[PDB]
Symmetry: C3
Subunit: 255 residues, 3 copies
């Protein structure tokens, strides 16, 4: 059987709120290594890459390999019933037609046992190889969420330019245009981070803000976010689920 016990049930709730707005039909690849998820949106522009290691689960147990076709919108409704401190436990059988969901209160008074039906998926699997990117921008997750939200009111697409000085976001629309230059000033404070970059070569691409707004739904999961981009390759937005795995977001450039 499959049995994964997560003490921090808040993590799984934050994960599912990050996918349901982008995708609603995906497959959960379950193995001894951990949980994996790979799916695209309707228009096949973006891709999700979820990984949850078994080393992070309080109690992991998987006999054979599993591939669970799960409706995310349905699952998100169920995981809305779980509390923040509630210990969430997923439990499938090896011939699983359904998937159980155990929401356990800390003191074990309120024990909830949900049961979600699976479905058959005609899935097309995507194998993305490892690439070395020209630029890797590290920034606060709340910072990137505001930038994408503010430029959404300006235009439909964002021009991201990168150099050695810093990264500049640009948008143009109806009421005009705006520019957000992210630099690395030298001040004196505490842990407020900035925006370190590992530029090998300057890049300048354009991306859709609609899908970037879907990516910022994984904000609560991580304190900071890395955006790795390179000429003629899709941009990767990564939210690292600390001590569990990571949530990558691939996105193709425009035109």
């Amino acid at each position: 059987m499959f049995e994964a016990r997560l003490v921090q049930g808040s993590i799984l709730k934050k994960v599912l709120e990050a996918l349901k707005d982008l995708i609603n039909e995906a497959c959960w690849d379950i193995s001894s290594s951990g949980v994996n998820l790979q799916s695209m949106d309707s228009s096949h522009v973006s891709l999700v890459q979820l990984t949850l290691r078994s080393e992070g689960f309080d109690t992991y147990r998987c006999d054979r390999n599993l591939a669970m076709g799960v409706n995310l919108t349905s699952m998100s409704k169920i995981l809305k019933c779980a509390g923040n401190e509630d210990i969430i436990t997923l439990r499938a059988e090896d011939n699983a037609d359904t998937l159980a969901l155990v929401f356990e209160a800390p003191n074990q008074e309120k024990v909830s046992d949900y049961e979600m039906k699976l479905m058959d998926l005609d899935v097309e699997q995507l194998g993305i190889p490892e690439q070395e990117y020209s630029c890797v921008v590290k920034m606060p997750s709340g910072e990137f969420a505001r930038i994408c939200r503010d430029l959404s009111h300006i235009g439909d697409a964002v021009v991201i330019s990168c150099a050695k000085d810093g990264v500049k976001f640009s948008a143009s629309g109806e009421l005009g245009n705006g520019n957000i230059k992210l630099s690395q000033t030298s001040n004196v404070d505490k842990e407020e981070e900035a925006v370190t970059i590992e530029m090998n070569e300057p890049v300048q691409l354009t991306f859709a803000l609609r899908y970037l707004n879907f990516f910022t739904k994984a904000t609560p999961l991580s304190s900071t976010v890395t955006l790795s981009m390179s000429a003629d390759v899709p941009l990767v937005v990564e939210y690292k689920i600390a001590d569990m795995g990571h949530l990558k977001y691939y996105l193709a450039p425009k035109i």
Copy 2:
């Protein structure tokens, strides 16, 4: 004349927010004992039983008996104008065509004097006799509100089963089904209560979650809620207005 002065005006605001979603046409039975209200919904499945003792009012004064046909939705709009710490004073005459509503600020700077027109009611009165119930479940008011809200996403009806071990809530719908078993674990903490029960005999009935969601609108009124149920009799949900009275909610079983 009728004159009732309530120092804690927040209570009356919490009371009216609990009825307006269930009923909008009810009669206020006023006497020397206190305030009483008894009315059913449109479909005559549920009943409200409000009681406010005169022993709890800062200043109660009733010459003769009164029966005031009051539009609750209209009254709820007016009582939305009262502050939280505002001393609310209700004042009718003995031949009342209208009902006055005095909202007094603590320091007596902001004094508001509202006037609401009454209406004639073709009311059908209901006399419910006292019954001894098979099971009385005591639980936090915020706990019962979450259970009813979470199962609402599952199905339309909830199967409540009771025993000696504990109480189990069940629902089944489109995306699947869920079960919430409330037990009495033995841990070590403080005043976090659990769910004591006085079962004489195990009961199992089914109720509508739509009307139960109307009942949980009386949450702010009480810290805990009692649900007394018995085979072939309507379930009673009671929110005790401390040092004032109680707000009962009768509900007929399904099928």
Copy 3:
């Protein structure tokens, strides 16, 4: 060129949220004295009078006179992108077709540079002379906002009566009527203010609550609000932008 630097960028955000609901087509009169704005609504019942002194700007610089026809709704969308502590800098040229908007983070890491297109206005200018009013009521800004909001549920118009004792607000509508008498009780507390008045002669006029609700959008700007009114003259609602200027709101009496 025109260059105004405001350290407290929150003020400008609060200003624009107060106009956009009342008016959306106005002209910004820029001179060495400071910023001025004078415009009416569609139905020409109310008038806005914004004044921001150059003595309050961290860095003011205006070569020649300027009159900028600015879409307020467009500008409000842009100023929604500015942070609370962000240092906002407005910068036009002397032949300005557009208007720049510099949003500078304190530590100067996040620097945003927006650009808004101006437009030609067929504006009708209004010269209001200084008048001595019969009554000037001083009250908390949050107090006046609640009074206008509560009477909005009652009726469409508010009857404001003034005397030596205090000021009384009255409204009548469908579910009935209400009265709010503001007096000056003698208690013992701290800085909770009340409602001082400089009545020369008692006044009683009627005004629309729809436009008064548009005026209360300038609440965050000031702690207290002054309402100066006089028989047969329009009522003036003033929100004083401390150490910067003031935001007046003229409103014609009904009938």
